[PDB]
C-alpha cells in the first residue's frame, strides 16, 4: 500500500538522521 | 494531574469503552474573525452534533501529533482541513492565513453527548465530562485545491526574542504613542512626517525629536542624548 | 526510468526561514567580544593602525578615511636643512 | 565609457566600451571585485563568463535621485567600503547582493543577477497548462509564519558626521505591532554612509516581508519549460482559488 | 595635488639654542591597485584626530 | 529571457511533439585535449547523427539533476558514460581524470536534424535552432570497469576562494615570473635553488631576495622588508 | 524493480533528513 | 579540492619568538589547475626548514 | 544469510581532501580583533599569565615562554645582602 509505506519511510528516515547527528558530534568525524 | 471527573476516569477503565468523538473550536476574536465550531462525524440522525446546548456542524478536519514535551523542541502538532469549494481559503483571503489564531480541541466520550444525538436518548447525560487542550495557528503550509495543512503552536512558546527588549539612546523614541509610557492624552497637533495635522484620524509620531517637542512631552522621551559617546 | 515518480515539491521548507531571505541573501553580523564593550564594528571600517604580518592587503571603493598597515616604523635623529641654504640655528 | 561619474548621467546607448575612472557606483564595484586579476578571482572566471548588461540595469537603477530626510537629493545606494579582513568569497558576494535587494544565477549559460524590479507579465497560465500529479489539484500555495514576520529591523550604519562611527537605526509598523507581535532583528547595512540608505534598506525589508507572504509551487510541460528562463514575472491565473472561470 | 605621486611640508619652526630634536618617520598602506589621492590637500593626513 | 527563436517556441506549443535529441561536447583545448562529440542515439540509417554539419557518434550518456537556484548550494549534476573496452579510462589516465575540461549540452527537435537523417529528408530542417548549455567537470566520483560516474559545476561557482588576494611577506615573492610584475626578459641566469645557469629550460626564480638580485629587479619585489615588527 | 525503489528511497530520504536539520537548530535542539 | 598553496604558522626563535608564516606552492601547479590556497599551522615547528 | 547493501564509500571520503586521509592535519586557533593583527600560537605563550583559569602547562624544550603567576608582593628590602659588610654611608 503506497501512504503507509510512506508515512513509514518517511519516519525511518528521520530518525535514522537523527541518529547520524546523534553519533556524528562525539570527539571527531566532521563535526556536524 | 489533569481536572478529569471521577466518572469518566473510571469509565475510561472498563473494557468496553465507546465511541471517542474529538471536536475543534477556531477562535479568531483576539483577530477579528468569529468563532466556528467543527466535528469530524456527525449523529445517527444525520444532524450537526449538539454538545452542552451549541452545534457542533460535520466538517473535514483532522489532528496528528498532539502532544506534551520538556526536552529539546517545542511540539508542533500538525492539523489538516479538506478545502472543497473555497472554503478555507475564503477565510485565509481575509484573515492573513489564520495565523495568530486560537485552537481549541475537546475531547468526550460517546455515551456522554446530548440526548437529541440519540433515537431512544442518552439517560447516561452529563454535559461536563471532557478534555480540553490549546494551541495557536502558527503557519499555513499547504493550501491545495484539496486539503489545508496548518501548524500548531503552543502559545507559551519563545523563540526569535530576546528577554531585555530595550536599545540604551537613540535619536529616536522607543514607546509607543498614546499608552501608558507616553503619557500624552492631547488633541491631535502633528502627523507621521510632522505637519500641523488637527485630524485625529491620522495622527502618528515619527518618534524623533521634534514629533516629541511637537507635544510637549520631552520629559518622557526615551532615546537618551549622548550620541557623541562613540565619537567622543 | 519512463516516468519520475515522487516529485517531492519544496513550498514553505524553504520559507521557514524567512521570505526577504529568497529574494536577498542577507548580511553577515560581526561576532562580539567583551573586552571590546559596546564598539559594535562591522566589516568596512577600520580607524586604528594595523599589523601587516602575514596578513591581506585592505582595499578601499569610497571616501571614507581609514587606518592602515605599519610597515615601517623608525625614529632617527633630526638633522638641521631646509630646501635651500638658510640655516639658522641662532 | 557612457557612464559619467560626476553626475551620474547616462547619453546614448552603451558598447562592450570601458574607460578607467573613479567612481562611487555600488553595480560596477561588484564588477571591479568579481572579474579582475591579481586579487579578485579573475583567474578563475573569464570577462564573458557574467552578464554586464544586467550589471549595467543596475547601475542604471541605482541612481534614481530618491529624496532624503533633510530634503536633499541623493542616489539610492553608494558603496562606502574598506575591506580589511580575509573572508569567503561567496561572503563577500552575498552581503553585495543583500545591499543591492539582488541574487545571482546562471542562467543561460551566463552568470545574472535580478532584483525586485517591477516589470511587465511575460507569461499566464492557467489550469489547462499545469499537470494534477495525483490528488487532482494542481497547484500548490504555502504562506510565511508568524514568528518569521519581522516588524521591527535595527540596521547598523556608519555615521561621517560625527565620529565614522557606527550607529543603529531601528525601523517598524505600528499597525504590524498591533496585528502581529514584535519581531526585532539586527542588520549590518553594507558600506552605508547615510542615514537615509540605511533606512530605506529597513524600510523596503519590512515592507517586502510583510507584503509578499504567499508562495506557489507547481509543474510546466516541456513546450514552457525552456520558454522560463527563471527569475522572470508571470501570472498564475487559477480558477479553482478566484471562484470563477478564468 | 592629485595625480598618482605627490608630496608635500610644513615650515619646521623650533632654532631657540642648539638642542637635538628627534623624527619620526613611518609608511602607511592604504589599499591596492589604481587609487585616487585625498579629497583635500595635506590636510586629510589626521594625527591623534585632527 | 532565453536565446529561443520564434520558429522553435511556435513548435513548442502543440500537442503532438516531436522527439527530443541531446547532444554533448566534451571540450579539453583548455586542458590538452581534443573536442569530442557524443550522442546518445542514432539516426535510422545506423549512422552518426549529423548536425550542422558535424557528426556526433553514439555513445551511452546521461545528464541528470540540472537545477539552477540562487540560493542554497551551487549546482553539480551529474553526468553518467558507459566504460566499456576501457575507453573512458584511458583519457582519465592521460587527461588527469577529465579535470578542468568543459561540457556543453545541446538540446534540439527532430523535425529539424540535417536530411541525411531520415529516408524520405526532412523539409523542415534549420541548423540554427537549439539550446545550449555549459559547465565544468569538477570529479570523477566513481569510474568502474563498466560505467562512469562526473559531477559537473557551473564556471562561476566560488568555493574555498578568498577574496583579499594580496598577501603580505617578508622574503617571499607573491606573483609569478615573468608575467607582468617580474619586468624581466633578459637571460636565463638562475635557476630553482639560485645556481649560475645560462639555460632557458630550467629558469625558474627562487622567490626570494637573493634571486631579485640576481636579476636586477630588486625595485619590483612584493616581500616587504618589515620582518622585525612583532619582536618589537 | 531494484533500481527505482532504490532511488525512491534515496530521494524519500533526502526531505526528511533537511526537515530533521532545519528543525534541530530552530530554538532547543542541538543546532544540527 | 586538490590544494597547491600552502601558509604555514611557525614560531622564528631568531627574531623574537613571533609567529611567522611562510607561502609554498608549485607553478605547474598554478599552470594546470587553479590555484587553492590553505593555512594551517605547523604544530612544534621551530625552524623554517621543518 | 545474505548480507546486502554494501555501499562502498570510498568516493564519499576524498570529498573532504585527500591529504587528510593520512594526517589528521593541525587544529588552528580563531583571530580576535581586539588583539591587533598578531596571530596566536598553539603551542607558545611568550605572555606571563594568571595562576588561575589557565592549567597548569607543560613545557617540551627551548622557548624562553612566560608563566603563570602565583603571588606577587611588594615590601621594603634589608640594606645587606649578609656578612658583616653593611655600609650606609
Ligand atoms: S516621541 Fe515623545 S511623543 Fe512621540 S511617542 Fe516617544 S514620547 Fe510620545
Ligand atoms: S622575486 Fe623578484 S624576480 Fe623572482 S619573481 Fe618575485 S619579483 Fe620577479
Same mark, same amino acid.
Given at each position: 500500500?503506497?501512504?503507509?509505506?510512506?508515512?513509514?519511510?518517511?519516519?525511518?528516515?528521520?530518525?535514522?538522521?537523527?541518529?547520524?547527528?546523534?553519533?556524528?558530534?562525539?570527539?571527531?568525524?566532521?563535526?556536524? | 494531574?489533569?481536572?478529569?471527573?471521577?466518572?469518566?476516569?473510571?469509565?475510561?477503565?472498563?473494557?468496553?469503552?465507546?465511541?471517542?468523538?474529538? /471536536?475543534?473550536?477556531?477562535?479568531?476574536?483576539?483577530?477579528?474573525?468569529?468563532?466556528?465550531?467543527?466535528?469530524?462525524?456527525?449523529?445517527?440522525?444525520?444532524?450537526?452534533?449538539?454538545?452542552?446546548?451549541?452545534?457542533?456542524?460535520?466538517?473535514?478536519?483532522?489532528?496528528?501529533?498532539?502532544? /506534551?514535551?520538556?526536552?529539546?523542541?517545542?511540539?508542533?502538532?500538525?492539523?489538516?482541513?479538506?478545502?472543497?469549494?473555497?472554503?478555507?481559503?475564503?477565510?485565509?483571503?481575509?484573515?492573513?492565513? /489564520?495565523?495568530?489564531?486560537?485552537?481549541?480541541?475537546?475531547?468526550?466520550?460517546?455515551?456522554?453527548?446530548?440526548?437529541?444525538?440519540?433515537?431512544?436518548?442518552?439517560?447516561?447525560?452529563?454535559?461536563?465530562?471532557?478534555?480540553?487542550?490549546?494551541?495557536?495557528?502558527?503557519?499555513?503550509?499547504?493550501?491545495?485545491?484539496?486539503?489545508?495543512?496548518?501548524? /500548531?503552536?503552543?502559545?507559551?512558546?519563545?523563540?526569535?526574542?530576546?528577554?531585555?527588549?530595550?536599545?540604551?539612546?537613540?535619536?529616536?523614541?522607543?514607546?509607543?504613542?498614546?499608552?501608558?509610557?507616553?503619557?500624552?492624552?492631547?488633541?491631535?497637533?502633528?502627523?507621521?512626517?510632522?505637519?500641523?495635522?488637527?485630524?485625529?484620524?491620522?495622527?502618528?509620531?515619527?518618534?524623533?525629536?521634534?514629533?516629541?517637542?511637537?507635544?510637549?512631552?520631552?520629559?518622557?522621551?526615551?532615546?537618551?542624548?549622548?550620541?557623541?559617546?562613540?565619537?567622543? | 526510468?519512463?516516468?519520475?515518480?515522487?516529485?517531492?515539491?519544496?513550498?514553505?521548507?524553504?520559507?521557514?526561514?524567512?521570505?526577504?531571505?529568497?529574494?536577498?541573501?542577507?548580511?553577515?553580523?560581526?561576532? *562580539?567580544?567583551?573586552?571590546? =564593550?559596546?564598539?559594535? =564594528?562591522?566589516?568596512?571600517?577600520?580607524?586604528? =593602525?594595523?599589523?601587516?604580518?602575514?596578513?591581506?592587503?585592505?582595499?578601499?571603493?569610497?571616501?571614507?578615511?581609514?587606518?592602515?598597515?605599519?610597515?615601517?616604523?623608525? *625614529?632617527?635623529?633630526?638633522?638641521?636643512?631646509?630646501?635651500?641654504?638658510?640655516?639658522? *640655528?641662532? | 565609457?557612457?557612464?559619467?561619474?560626476?553626475? !551620474?548621467?547616462?547619453?546614448?546607448?552603451?558598447?562592450?566600451?570601458?574607460?578607467?575612472?573613479?567612481?562611487?557606483?555600488?553595480?560596477?564595484?561588484?564588477?571591479?571585485?568579481?572579474?579582475?586579476?591579481?586579487?579578485?578571482?579573475?583567474?578563475?572566471?573569464?570577462?564573458?563568463?557574467?552578464?554586464?548588461?544586467?550589471?549595467?540595469?543596475?547601475?542604471?537603477?541605482?541612481?534614481?535621485?530618491?529624496?532624503?530626510?533633510?530634503?536633499?537629493?541623493?542616489?539610492?545606494?553608494?558603496?562606502?567600503?574598506?575591506?580589511?579582513?580575509?573572508?569567503?568569497?561567496?561572503?563577500?558576494?552575498?552581503?553585495?547582493?543583500?545591499?543591492?535587494?539582488?541574487?545571482?544565477?546562471?542562467?543561460?549559460?551566463?552568470?545574472?543577477? $535580478?532584483?525586485?524590479?517591477?516589470?511587465?507579465?511575460?507569461?499566464?497560465?492557467? !489550469?489547462?497548462?499545469?499537470?494534477?500529479?495525483?490528488?487532482?489539484?494542481?497547484?500548490?500555495?504555502?504562506?510565511?509564519?508568524?514568528?518569521?514576520?519581522?516588524?521591527?529591523?535595527?540596521?547598523?550604519?556608519?555615521?561621517?558626521?560625527?565620529?565614522?562611527?557606527?550607529?543603529?537605526?531601528?525601523?517598524?509598523?505600528?499597525?504590524?505591532?498591533?496585528?502581529?507581535?514584535?519581531?526585532?532583528?539586527?542588520?549590518?547595512?553594507?558600506?552605508?554612509?547615510?542615514?537615509?540608505?540605511?533606512?530605506?534598506?529597513?524600510?523596503?525589508?519590512?515592507?517586502?516581508?510583510?507584503?509578499?507572504?504567499?508562495?506557489?509551487?507547481?509543474?510546466?510541460?516541456?513546450?514552457?519549460?525552456?520558454?522560463?528562463?527563471?527569475? $522572470?514575472?508571470?501570472?498564475?491565473?487559477?480558477?479553482?482559488?478566484?471562484?470563477?472561470?478564468? | 595635488?592629485?595625480?598618482?605621486?605627490?608630496?608635500?611640508?610644513?615650515?619646521?619652526?623650533?632654532? &631657540?639654542?642648539?638642542?637635538?630634536?628627534?623624527?619620526?618617520?613611518? @609608511?602607511?598602506? @592604504?589599499?591596492?591597485?589604481? @587609487?585616487?589621492?585625498?579629497? &583635500?590637500?595635506?590636510?586629510?593626513?589626521?594625527?591623534?584626530?585632527?
Amino acid at each position: 500500500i503506497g501512504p503507509a509505506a510512506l508515512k513509514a519511510v518517511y519516519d525511518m528516515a528521520r530518525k535514522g538522521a537523527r541518529d547520524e547527528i546523534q553519533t556524528q558530534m562525539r570527539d571527531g568525524g566532521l563535526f556536524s | 494531574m489533569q481536572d478529569i471527573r471521577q466518572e469518566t476516569l473510571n469509565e475510561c477503565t472498563r473494557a468496553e469503552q465507546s465511541a471517542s468523538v474529538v /471536536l475543534w473550536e477556531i477562535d479568531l476574536t483576539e483577530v477579528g474573525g468569529e468563532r466556528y465550531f467543527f466535528c469530524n462525524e456527525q449523529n445517527e440522525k444525520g444532524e450537526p452534533v449538539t454538545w452542552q446546548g451549541r452545534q457542533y456542524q460535520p466538517y473535514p478536519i483532522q489532528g496528528s501529533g498532539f502532544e /506534551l514535551n520538556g526536552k529539546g523542541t517545542s511540539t508542533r502538532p500538525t492539523l489538516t482541513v479538506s478545502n472543497l469549494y473555497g472554503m478555507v481559503t475564503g477565510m485565509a483571503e481575509d484573515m492573513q492565513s /489564520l495565523v495568530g489564531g486560537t485552537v481549541v480541541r475537546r475531547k468526550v466520550y460517546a455515551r456522554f453527548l446530548d440526548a437529541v444525538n440519540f433515537v431512544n436518548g442518552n439517560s447516561y447525560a452529563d454535559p461536563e465530562q471532557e478534555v480540553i487542550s490549546r494551541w495557536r495557528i502558527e503557519q499555513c503550509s499547504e493550501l491545495s485545491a484539496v486539503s489545508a495543512s496548518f501548524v /500548531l503552536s503552543t502559545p507559551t512558546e519563545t523563540d526569535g526574542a530576546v528577554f531585555p527588549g530595550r536599545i540604551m539612546l537613540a535619536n529616536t523614541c522607543t514607546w509607543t504613542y498614546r499608552g501608558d509610557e507616553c503619557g500624552y492624552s492631547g488633541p491631535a497637533v502633528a502627523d507621521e512626517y510632522d505637519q500641523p495635522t488637527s485630524d485625529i484620524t491620522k495622527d502618528k509620531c515619527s518618534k524623533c525629536l521634534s514629533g516629541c517637542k511637537f507635544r510637549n512631552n520631552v520629559g518622557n522621551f526615551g532615546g537618551f542624548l549622548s550620541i557623541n559617546k562613540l565619537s567622543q | 526510468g519512463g516516468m519520475t515518480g515522487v516529485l517531492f515539491s519544496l513550498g514553505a521548507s524553504m520559507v521557514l526561514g524567512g521570505v526577504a531571505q529568497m529574494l536577498a541573501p542577507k548580511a553577515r553580523t560581526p561576532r *562580539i567580544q567583551t573586552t571590546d =564593550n559596546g564598539k559594535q =564594528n562591522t566589516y568596512f571600517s577600520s580607524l586604528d =593602525n594595523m599589523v601587516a604580518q602575514g596578513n591581506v592587503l585592505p582595499v578601499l571603493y569610497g571616501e571614507m578615511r581609514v587606518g592602515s598597515r605599519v610597515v615601517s616604523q623608525e *625614529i632617527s635623529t633630526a638633522d638641521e636643512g631646509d630646501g635651500g641654504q638658510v640655516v639658522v *640655528i641662532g | 565609457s557612457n557612464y559619467n561619474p560626476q553626475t !551620474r548621467q547616462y547619453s546614448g546607448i552603451w558598447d562592450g566600451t570601458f574607460k578607467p575612472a573613479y567612481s562611487n557606483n555600488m553595480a560596477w564595484c561588484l564588477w571591479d571585485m568579481l572579474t579582475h586579476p591579481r586579487y579578485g578571482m579573475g583567474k578563475r572566471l573569464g570577462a564573458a563568463d557574467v552578464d554586464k548588461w544586467a550589471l549595467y540595469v543596475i547601475g542604471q537603477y541605482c541612481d534614481q535621485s530618491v529624496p532624503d530626510g533633510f530634503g536633499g537629493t541623493e542616489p539610492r545606494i553608494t558603496c562606502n567600503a574598506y575591506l580589511t579582513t580575509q573572508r569567503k568569497a561567496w561572503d563577500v558576494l552575498s552581503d553585495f547582493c543583500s545591499a543591492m535587494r539582488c541574487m545571482p544565477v546562471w542562467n543561460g549559460q551566463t552568470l545574472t543577477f $535580478v532584483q525586485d524590479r517591477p516589470s511587465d507579465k511575460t507569461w499566464t497560465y492557467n !489550469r489547462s497548462n499545469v499537470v494534477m500529479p495525483d490528488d487532482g489539484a494542481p497547484f500548490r500555495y504555502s504562506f510565511s509564519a508568524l514568528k518569521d514576520r519581522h516588524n521591527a529591523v535595527e540596521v547598523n550604519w556608519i555615521d561621517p558626521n560625527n565620529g565614522w562611527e557606527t550607529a543603529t537605526e531601528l525601523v517598524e509598523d505600528t499597525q504590524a505591532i498591533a496585528r502581529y507581535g514584535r519581531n526585532v532583528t539586527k542588520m549590518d547595512a553594507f558600506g552605508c554612509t547615510s542615514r537615509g540608505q540605511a533606512h530605506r534598506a529597513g524600510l523596503w525589508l519590512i515592507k517586502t516581508e510583510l507584503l509578499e507572504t504567499q508562495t506557489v509551487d507547481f509543474s510546466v510541460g516541456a513546450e514552457g519549460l525552456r520558454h522560463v528562463p527563471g527569475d $522572470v514575472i508571470e501570472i498564475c491565473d487559477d480558477d479553482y482559488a478566484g471562484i470563477s472561470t478564468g | 595635488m592629485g595625480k598618482g605621486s605627490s608630496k608635500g611640508h610644513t615650515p619646521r619652526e623650533a632654532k &631657540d639654542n642648539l638642542k637635538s630634536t628627534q623624527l619620526l618617520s613611518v @609608511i602607511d598602506a @592604504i589599499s591596492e591597485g589604481p @587609487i585616487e589621492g585625498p579629497v &583635500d590637500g595635506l590636510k586629510s593626513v589626521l594625527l591623534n584626530s585632527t
